[PDB]
Amino acid sequence: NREDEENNMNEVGYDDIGGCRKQMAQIREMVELPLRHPQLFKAIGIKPPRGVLMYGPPGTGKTLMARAVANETGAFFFLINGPEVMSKMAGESESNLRKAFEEAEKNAPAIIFIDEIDSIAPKRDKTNGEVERRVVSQLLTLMDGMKARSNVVVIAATNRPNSIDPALRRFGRFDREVDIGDATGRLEVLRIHTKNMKLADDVDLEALAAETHGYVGADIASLCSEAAMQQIREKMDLIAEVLDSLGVTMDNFRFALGNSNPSALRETVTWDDVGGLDEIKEELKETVEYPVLHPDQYTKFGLSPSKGVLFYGPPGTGKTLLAKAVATEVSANFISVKGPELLSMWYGESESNIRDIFDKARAAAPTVVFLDELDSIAKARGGSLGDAGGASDRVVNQLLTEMDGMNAKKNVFVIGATNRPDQIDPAILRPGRLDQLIYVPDENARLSILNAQLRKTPLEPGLELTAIAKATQGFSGADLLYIVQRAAKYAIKDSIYITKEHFAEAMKTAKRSVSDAELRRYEAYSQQMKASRGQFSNFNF
Amino acid sequence: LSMWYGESESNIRDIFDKARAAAPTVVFLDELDSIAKARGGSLGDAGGASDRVVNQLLTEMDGMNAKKNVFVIGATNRPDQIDPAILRPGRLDQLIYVPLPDENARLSILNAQLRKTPLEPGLELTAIAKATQGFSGADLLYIVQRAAKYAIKDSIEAHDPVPYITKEHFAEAMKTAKRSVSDAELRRYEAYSQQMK
Amino acid sequence: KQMAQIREMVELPLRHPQLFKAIGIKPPRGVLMYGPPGTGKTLMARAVANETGAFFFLINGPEVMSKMAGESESNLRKAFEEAEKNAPAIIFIDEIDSIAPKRDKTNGEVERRVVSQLLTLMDGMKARSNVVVIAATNRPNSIDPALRRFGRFDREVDIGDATGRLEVLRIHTKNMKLADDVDLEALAAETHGYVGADIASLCSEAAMQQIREKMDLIDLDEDEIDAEVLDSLGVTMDNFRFALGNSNTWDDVGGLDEIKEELKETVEYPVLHPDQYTKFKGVLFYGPTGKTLLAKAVATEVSANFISVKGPELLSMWYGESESNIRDIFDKARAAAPTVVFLDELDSIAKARGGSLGDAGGASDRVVNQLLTEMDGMNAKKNVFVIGATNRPDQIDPAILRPGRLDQLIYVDENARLSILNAQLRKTPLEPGLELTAIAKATQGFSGADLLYIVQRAAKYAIKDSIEAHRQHEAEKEVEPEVDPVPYITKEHFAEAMKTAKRSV
Amino acid sequence: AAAAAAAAAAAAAVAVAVAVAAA
Ligand SMILES: Nc1ncnc2c1ncn2[C@@H]1O[C@H](COP(=O)(O)OP(=O)(O)O)[C@@H](O)[C@H]1O
Ligand SMILES: Nc1ncnc2c1ncn2[C@@H]1O[C@H](COP(=O)(O)OP(=O)(O)O)[C@@H](O)[C@H]1O
């Protein structure tokens, strides 16, 4: 006794699914409307569809929804795995598939979930094995033919739905394709995963829904389980009264976020580590935070926001730090790729890499992309007359197509960062791609840089950061980081707070890696960009 | 294009057979400057593959086929670097040039872009259209986007305070302009157009 | 640490189920035991089974099959229902590599059926079962990831002692008239890597050597033995001694005393507690000397992990792959934290990327960028340490000699050459009338590799003289000296080997 | 009485492909 009741109540249901509202309701109605009343389909005089191809990233919850529908309806969930049914014996995997379909058609109208169909559907042309084509033909025979199916629906699951046969993706077999790929759904999953345990009273789920921006849904349960394990692990070192006042806290969730990092997603500061550049911080904060926080006002105005920002100037200025600081406050991801870390010697590999990065960008909205070394990627294609020139032309055309081509530009924030804007072609600087031409160029700013660098550091009341910043006279953020690193090395040498003599002995060994003629060139380029903006005034209508 | 040997041509054959099967069909080839590059001679493996792909395109658009309805639209920005075997009637017969918009065209572009945007009643766009030159549709889009951003700024700082984007918003947005296409790049297009003429 | 971990994992989920449920975590399900063979996983399983009065249903790997089809699933269900029926207990599944064939390389169907049955039986354990499973394996790679998924097996231990060895000795050898002058503490100390059965083989070989000792003197008379040889039987200490002997450094770097002292102290301090650093990685050697010898002494006698690669060993003439090699090398480095990445011949890899303008230049630039972006991303966590060594420091990249990535610069004589020759001539029967100070004073700009070459040419000349004397003795026998006519390497062999000795750099 | 049976299932081969470089 009791066991048969518990194993009935532990079953999953529609109350245990979160975020996939519209597709869950669509599958629910298209399954249950045949099962609740067939008189409606008798009156309308048509047969319902009998095939669902589910696609998306692995770990989303597709088989959980299929099991929930199979639990909420009087069906029989039979699970068929992809690599399990395939064997090396000739005529054995087809026999296993026929036996599974006969078992599904024998007892009751049931629901078949064949998982990982991409392993047993090699498109009949790219494969070399005969057994794969044989089981593909067995699947098309069991799904369509003379008296093929008698009141039974099959469900599939895959990650890449393009490597399936066009005969498999036909009507009657997989006639409905469901894309199970946000913050409110993640909060619903957190609420349904933290339902059977009293965690605390002062735990706020807003930070847990905003910081885990790249979690697919199957990692949230592992996160909560790891937190519940770590709480009992850290609360058992010393130990009726122990069971009272149990549960996880915010530091437990912070430790779960820190010890465990993988988000099962292929994705590569807080407004304080950057010093100076107040108007640049304000402009980036505006042009990033408004299309994320107020979509309804932008749909009321009926206009699409701007996307691309391009920075240029001397190296060691803080462009990557600015990109991280504008990415860190939103709930977006961050894909920071480098210039020469995508080019290959093969034919088509660089453009394939560009397509994969942009597909991974548009597969998770919103997402800011950080393209570095635009002078190394674009090269202002023009004419080179060579193999490297043709590869550069093809890379530039693929990049131009991915920025503004046959796309939807849902939520992609491309941010470029180069140190030579003269070697960029005038097609990426067109508005709509990289329209924001923000130039990133003092002692009052170096004070803020030293205050942002010395955030969590034991400081001396006798040191003067104004006296440190006054003797710079044209240093960079990299030079200030080198000075701070030398002071920290001298501090750890004196240990094995920061004192003033460490800075006094480290200020002499400065670098000043930037010369003067490159500064003259950058000022001449900025003056040319200022003089190109001509005959423009307040412009009274 | 593909990494391997003889696969970009299988790709071209597959897409064109798909087009011929599901006729009528419109195949939009974007940036022909990549695929349909002047064959000539490059003396390299990339040269060999980029010539094989062009030759496949020639035999697929005008070869031994049934002439079923398939309309190929090409869109390029360097038409001087395309094989003349493509630029010929039978494959791509008519070369339509789209210069920068004139005053009426740009005014119509602004009106089309603001089709679904609340605007002031007395704000005519003729002044902003006459007080510009050398611009493109993308540039007009940028000006409109900046005006919308200033209007949203005003709305947020007020917070239906400002239902309509106003003349001062548009003027402040137009205070800075893009000027995407420079004369250095435009004179080459003018030379190409007059050479074609 | 592993014994305390497994004791907690077998006590806390077995004694306070109410407390665990109150906490609200039911993650604990199955434990895995991997590692090299002969470490004590079966001994730990027996100690767990004999430290608890709970039920213990041991099931080995290939003992689950039978002629009847499907009997294996019925046996698995019977064992699981017996362990759930009797008591809150622990299940031991020994040799899981036979039941789980990793599901991809196999082609059978009853193996897939028994893997699916074990999956659906491990998943079907509720909170009121309160049973755990323990599983031991030999190789940690031929396991299903579906069995290693979250829910069944997530908490694995890496068993990589003398008291347990003395306990096993006192368990085995306590049933015999042993000796009167035996100390099993010495056998437990001198026995290092044995586990379970190797001590039994040691005792068996001790008994065999005792029988060999008391056979050639007392004349057992194999047709009919006497009765005086039965009671007079004792396995003495020497029998166990040569049964162990017949079964199965930092002082090696002469000179550079303050250099090795600073190197060791610095290495120890960085990997030590970080509280002082919080309150307040790498190095490179270059010179004309023993750099790889010092890297070997670090890899041996530092009490930390060690991974070393050559210069162009990680290079692929293609693209991407040559960066993926360094990427997964640094992935193995961050996986086995803390570690030391000994990059030999750094110049060959870096080459000061600069400008080369070719396919080799592009590969060098991509390698340097991969190295910089996979070394500069090392925080205070994962505590890796990169050691570089070179002969020419001119051709190293200043982008890799920058501060914040690799800032230390260890610069690396006659006495060191004499110490190197004395460490190379350690396990060698040298002639007693020979001094190496003449070779140390004569050789000035030489190196340890060419000193080894000199010693090897001397050994070759001595071997040639020995084989010539041996064939002369064979010819004289066919038409006696000692065991070797030249047992030691004379000074003439060294004086003839140094004739064709050069310098390396 | 008992009886024997013969069985010949399948085999698996390995292919070789050609790649194209861009200098
Ligand atoms: N929408 C969701 N609501 C609740 N739990 C979910 C959701 N999506 C995924 N999960 C959790 O993720 C885990 C894995 O999901 P499942 O559908 O079983 O497999 P898959 O990893 O193939 O997506 C499940 O244990 C489930 O608890
Ligand atoms: N305004 C600033 N405040 C604080 N640190 C800064 C600032 N500007 C630059 N830095 C420091 O200088 C470094 C610049 O590195 P990075 O952003 O990669 O290069 P670049 O500035 O050439 O794009 C950063 O590590 C950052 O810590």
Query: Chain D within 8 Å of A385 (Cβ-Cβ)?
Result: no
3-state secondary structure (DSSP) of residue C55: coil
C401 φψ region: left (φ > 0), alpha (ψ -120 to 50), beta (else): alpha
User: Is C48 in a helix, a strand, or coil?
Assistant: helix
3-state SS of A277-292 is CHHHHHHHHHHHHHHH
Which runs of consecutive H residues, i.e. helices, occur in C303-343? Answer: 321-335
Residue C178 CA: distances (Å) to CA of C199, C207, C260: 15, 10, 49
| Contact between residue A334 and residue A268 where contact means Cβ atoms under 8 Å apart | yes
> Is the minimum CB–CB distance between C231 and chain A shorter than 8 Å?
no
Surface-to-core class of residue B135, CB atoms within 10 Å of its CB (0-12 exposed, 13-18 middle, 19+ buried):
buried
C-beta of residue A343 within 8 angstroms of C-beta of residue A389: no
Write out residues 314-353 of C within 8 Å (CB-CB) of A: 318-320, 323
**C-alpha distances in Å from residue B171, one per residue of A402, B111, B176:** 33, 17, 9
Ligand 2 neighbours, Cβ below 6 Å, are: A 274-276, 315-321, 449, 452-453, 477-478, 481
| Cis amide bond preceding B24, omega within 30 | yes
Q: Cis omega (within 30 of 0) on the bond before B99?
A: no
Distance CA C239, CA C230 (A): 18
Do A248 and A193 form a contact (C-beta atoms < 8 A)? no
In the β-sheet with A153-158, what is the strand arrangement from edge to edge?
Answer: A77-80, A111-115, A153-158, A51-55, A176-179
Nearest C-alpha neighbor of C422 from the set C260, C254, C300: C254
Query: What are the two backbone dihedrals, phi and then psi, of residue A230, each rounded to the nearest 5 degrees?
Result: -70, -30
Q: H/E element holding A371?
A: strand A367-372
Residues β-bridged to residue A367: A333, A412
Alpha helices in C179-224 (DSSP H): 184-190, 198-213
> Of C194, C185, C251, C151, which is closest to residue C40 (Cα–Cα)?
C194
Say which DSSP state A115 is in. E
Residue A375 CA neighbour count, 13 Å, CB half: 10
Which-ligand-closest: CA of C373? 2
Chains B and C are touching, with contact defined as 3 or more CB–CB pairs separated by less than 8 Å? no
Instruction: Tell me if A387 sits within 8 A of B45, measured CB to CB.
Output: yes
- The secondary structure element, H or E, covering residue A403 is helix A387-403
Measured in whole angstroms, the distance separating CA B153 from the mean position of its chain's CA atoms is 32
Q: How far apart are CA A256 and CA A193, in angstroms?
A: 15
Q: Which residues in chain D are followed by a discontinuity, with C-to-N distance exceeding 2.5 angstroms? A: none
Instruction: State the burial class of residue B99 (Cβ atoms within 10 Å of its Cβ: 0-12, 13-18, 19+).
Output: exposed
Q: Alpha-carbon distance B12 to B45, whole Å? A: 19
The residue written with tokens 């709480």 in the block is A231
Nearest to D19 among A129, A130, A346 (CB): A346
Tokens standing for A120? 């047993």
CB A68 within 8 A of CB A155: no
Q: Which residues are within 8 A (CB) of C462 and not within 5 positions of it... i.e. 6 or more apart?
A: C486, C489, C490, C493
Distance of CA C404 to the CA centre of its chain: 33
Q: Which two tokens stand for residue C251?
A: 């002082």
Rounded Cα gap, residues C444 and A461, in angstroms: 56
- Whether the CB of D22 is below 8 Å from some CB of chain A: the reply is yes
**By CB neighbour count within 10 A (0-12 exposed, 13-18 middle, 19+ buried), where does C483 fall?**
exposed
Q: How far is the CA of A275 from the centre of ligand 2 (A)?
A: 9
Under DSSP, the state recorded for C430 is: B
3-class secondary-structure state, position C105: coil
Distance CA A208, CA C162 (A): 48
Among protein residues, the one with the nearest Cα to ligand 1's atom 22 is A59
CA distance C375 to A453: 21
Distance CA C226, CA C245 (A): 32
A179: helix, strand or coil: strand
Instruction: Tell me, letter by letter, the H, E, C secondary structure of C244-268.
Output: HHCCCCHHHCCCCHHHHHHHHHHHH
DSSP SS3 for C199:
helix
Identity of the amino acid at C135 = A
Sequence-distant (≥ 6) Cβ neighbours of residue A74 within 8 angstroms? A35, A108
State the smallest CA–CA distance between residue C103 and chain A in angstroms.
7
Amino acid at C154: D
C103 chain-A contacts, CB cut-off 8 A:
83-84
CA gyration radius, chain C: 31
The DSSP output letter for C58 is E
Long-range Cβ pairs for the range A197-202 (8 Å, 24+): A197/A228, A197/A247, A197/A248, A197/C24, A198/A246, A198/A247, A198/C24, A199/A247, A199/A248, A199/A249, A200/A247, A200/A248, A200/A249, A202/A249, A202/A250
Rg over CA atoms, chain B = 23
Contact D23 B46 (CB under 8 A): yes
Tokens 């611009």 — which residue?
A: B135
Cβ within 8 Å, pair D20-B45: yes
Strands A367-372 and A412-417: parallel
Contact A433, A400 (CB under 8 A): yes
Coil vs helix vs strand at A180: coil
DSSP at A12:
-
Among A271, A321, A438, residue to substitute to test ligand 2 (most atoms within 8 Å of Cβ): A321
Does any ligand 1 atom lie closer than 6 A to the CB of residue A187? no
The experimental method, as deposited, was cryo-EM
Residue pair C129/C17 in contact (Cβ under 8 Å)? The answer is no
Q: Which amino acid is at B148?
A: A
Nearest Cα to B90, choosing from B60, B123, B54? B60
Ligand 1 in contact with A416 (CB < 6 A)? Answer: no
Q: Which residues of B touch D19 (CB under 8 A)?
A: 3-5
- The answer for C68, left when phi > 0, alpha when psi is -120 to 50, beta otherwise, is beta
The residue among A529, A442, A517 whose CA lies nearest residue A480 is A442
From B42, B38, B39, select the one nearest B76 (Cα to Cα): B38
Q: Which of A350, A339, A344 is nearest to A372 (CA)?
A: A339
